[PDB]
Structure 1
Amino acid sequence: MREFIPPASRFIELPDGFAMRRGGALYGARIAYETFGSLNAARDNAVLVLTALSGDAHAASRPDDPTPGWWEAMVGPGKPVDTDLWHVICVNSLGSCKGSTGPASTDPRTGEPYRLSFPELSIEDIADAAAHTVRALGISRLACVVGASMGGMSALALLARHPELARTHISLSGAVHALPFSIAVRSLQREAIRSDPGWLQGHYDEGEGPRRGMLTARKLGMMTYRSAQEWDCRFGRTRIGERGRFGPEFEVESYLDFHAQRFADRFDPNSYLYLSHAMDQFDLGDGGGGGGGAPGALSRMRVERALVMGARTDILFPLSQQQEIADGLSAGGADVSFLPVDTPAGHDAFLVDIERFGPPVAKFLAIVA
């Protein structure tokens, strides 16, 4: 299969040829999306959510798919992103494997999966595909565009390329571009996959594939997403309660393997490579002829208000990167609320510490309403 599509997924076909930033174009492509909450008469209460690398469009549960979403505590009736007030639209990023066209999808020209024939993917492509999706749904201007992690990059690209499409912006643990450490981490993750003989140069298809490499990729990621101190605090030196050479012995090891399995079981290796690479290549200030680099690009955006948050313990996208986003948007006239979160959950905080990330989001949206 290689594609893991939520049962209530809906799709917007990307008409004819969808040109990709680094060359080539996609034909017969589509974007999977899901909505939560009612769109009002003026169609001015829509909120687009661009996800992290591993997410899908099922941000929250619904009657037609009661399974909890990846942001179940953040999106819903009476929640931080209140669906009683907003029409939330969440899209699976182009290049992914949860419904939107990606490497695991069928190429109409061959009848087979794209695999590594998929055009190099750029954050800008994800943004452009999301913009088309919102417009295809009859929305000309979003009340807000929300982006977290990789989605924070996608959101900035959308604001720079489609300035009239969003009134406000919520940026959670994002960045204008990747710094060396995070690049090194993703490099090792991709290495774990490419070093697995099961990858077969991307032609694993229905075989087991580089499952070993995927597990490791996820473990390395998880270890970098939350503070070392929190890890020591959550597991200590506790041995596995389950009680043959050099195998796992500590609960922390069992914990990592358990979650690594779930990821490896629901993600396409090639899709992972493309998305990971896109994160390393994105650079908001790199082109267009405007000048000033990233700060300049942020200043030229047209959002009226913005909420920018980051975790003090985040080592993937350090707090300073979120502050840079806030400063640039403010330099351009936006009314920006910046909030550093004192959480031990690092980069994963926007997902696992909604107790802390939620209230500020609710506060901001109450002003936008």
Structure 2
Amino acid sequence: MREFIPPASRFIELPDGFAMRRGGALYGARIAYETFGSLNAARDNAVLVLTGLSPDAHAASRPDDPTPGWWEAMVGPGKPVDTDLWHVICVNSLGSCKGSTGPASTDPRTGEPYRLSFPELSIEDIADAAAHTVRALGISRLACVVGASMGGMSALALLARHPELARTHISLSGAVHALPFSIAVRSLQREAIRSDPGWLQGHYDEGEGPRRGMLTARKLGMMTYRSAQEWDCRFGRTRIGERGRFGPEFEVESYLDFHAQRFADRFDPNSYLYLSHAMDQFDLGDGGGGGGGAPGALSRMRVERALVMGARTDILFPLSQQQEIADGLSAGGADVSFLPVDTPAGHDAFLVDIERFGPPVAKFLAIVA
């Protein structure tokens, strides 16, 4: 397939040519999205959610697609992001493979998948495509734009490029740009894929493809998404309970391989490369003629209030990067609540430790309501 689209996906066509930041334009492209909760009469309770690199737009379950969403505990009736109050809109990032146009999508000019002919992807493109989607839904101003991980970058790009589109912002484990360690990690992940003979320079198509490289990319990711101490605490030196040369012997290995399979079977290799690359290239304050770098860009944003959170154990987007976002937004007049979370779940905390990330989000939205 190379494209894995949720059954209740809806789409917004990106009209005519959609110009990409680093050159070229997409034609016949679209953004896959899903909504949760009722949009009110004034259309002023819309909340946009920009995702991390790997999820689809199915953030939460719904009667028409009861399968749990990737953020099931965060979004829903009576939950931190209460769908009884908000009209949540989640979009599949442009460049992905869960419905929105990406490398695995068909190029109308050739009738074949774009593969590596897909225009270089930028975080700004993901932001612009999401902005168009929200406007196409008849919403001129979001009550809030939520961004987590890669989505934190996408959200900042949206706030900088479409200042009148969001009243408030919730930034979870985001950054204005990637630091060396995370660049090194993503570099190795992309390497695991490009080093797999099955990649065939991106022309693996219906073939098996670089599946082994994908499993590995996912393993390396998982290992850096949560604190080393937490791993030692969850598995210890326990051997595999399931009971030929140099094969797995520890439960931690079994665990990683297990979840790695789910990713390798549900993600397009080329799409991963493009998204991974976009994350490394993003730099909030590098252009526009405004000055002040990232802090300057944040100060110029027009959000009224913002909630910024990060995990103390996050080694991909360290806490200091979340503090930087909070400081920059506040420097520009926004009423900012910053909250460092004492969790061992690192970068995955906003996904797996909603028991800690959830209450502060609810508290902030209660004020926005």
TM-score range normalised by the length of the shorter chain: over 0.9
Cα drift, residue 93 of structure 1: 0.1
Cα drift, residue 226 of structure 1: 0.2
Residue of structure 1 in register with 2:161 after alignment: 161
Deviations 1:93-152 (A, max 9, x none): 000000000000000000000000000000000000000000000000000000000000
Deviations 1:9-64 (A, max 9, x none): 00000000000000000000000000000000000000000000001100000000
Deviations 1:268-312 (A, max 9, x none): 000000000000000000000000000000000000000000000
Cα drift, residue 187 of structure 1: 0.1
Percent identity of equivalent pairs = 99
1:76 is the counterpart of 2:76:
yes
Cα drift, residue 357 of structure 1: 0.1
Cα drift, residue 196 of structure 1: 0.1
Cα drift, residue 250 of structure 1: 0.2
Residue of structure 2 in register with 1:51 after alignment: 51
Quote the Cα distance in structure 2 between the aligned partners of 1:306 and 1:242.
48
Instruction: List alignment gaps of at least 5 residues for structure 2.
Output: none
TM-score (norm 2): 1.00
TM-score (norm 1): 1.00
1:60 is the counterpart of 2:56:
no
Residue of structure 2 in register with 1:300 after alignment: 300
Deviations 1:316-360 (A, max 9, x none): 000000000000000000000000000000000000000000000
Quote the Cα distance in structure 2 between the aligned partners of 1:98 and 1:235.
32
Quote the Cα distance in structure 2 between the aligned partners of 1:262 and 1:55.
12
Deviations 1:175-211 (A, max 9, x none): 0000000000000000000000000000000000000
Quote the Cα distance in structure 2 between the aligned partners of 1:264 and 1:343.
28
Quote the Cα distance in structure 2 between the aligned partners of 1:2 and 1:214.
13
Quote the Cα distance in structure 1 between the aligned partners of 2:257 and 2:129.
34
3-state SS of paired residue (2:48): strand
Aligned alpha-carbon RMSD (Å)? 0.2
Deviations 1:211-247 (A, max 9, x none): 0000000000000000000000000000000001100
Quote the Cα distance in structure 2 between the aligned partners of 1:286 and 1:192.
30
Instruction: List alignment gaps of at least 5 residues for structure 1.
Output: none
Quote the Cα distance in structure 2 between the aligned partners of 1:243 and 1:19.
54
Quote the Cα distance in structure 2 between the aligned partners of 1:56 and 1:2.
13
3-state SS of paired residue (1:90): strand
State how many pairs are aligned: 369
3-state SS of paired residue (1:49): strand
Residue of structure 2 in register with 1:209 after alignment: 209
